[PDB]
């Protein structure tokens, strides 16, 4: 699924991202329905932006503003998220 999140300057997106460190993308990790990406949503705050848009705990992060991040390290994914400012387009997969 794709979520288009728009937050105000003064709030967060309301999710906690978790996943592999790497600094440089690595490598031939092959996504599978059971582990579709290196980064996922450890939690989502009720009444937060992500939750209102339907993102849920456990969702795996596939794309950030059009860029595939399945094999990308955590620092770099955070950087890409910050680059977009108050707008964030996320593609995710629910392993549920």
């Amino acid at each position: 699924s794709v979520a288009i999140l728009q937050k105000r300057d003064h709030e967060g997106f309301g999710f906690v991202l978790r996943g592999a460190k790497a600094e440089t993308p690595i490598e031939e990790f092959t996504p599978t329905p059971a582990f579709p990406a290196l980064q996922y949503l450890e939690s989502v705050d009720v009444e937060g932006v992500a939750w209102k848009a339907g993102l849920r705990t456990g969702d795996f992060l596939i794309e950030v503003n059009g860029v595939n991040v399945v094999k990308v390290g955590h620092k770099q994914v955070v950087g890409l998220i910050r680059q977009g400012g108050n707008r964030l387009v996320m593609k995710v997969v629910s392993v549920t």
């Binding site: 997106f13 999710f15 906690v16 978790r18 996943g19 592999a20 450890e42 955590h74």
Partner: peptide, 6 residues
Amino acid sequence: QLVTSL
């Protein structure tokens, strides 16, 4: 792993 609040 790393964990970031966003």
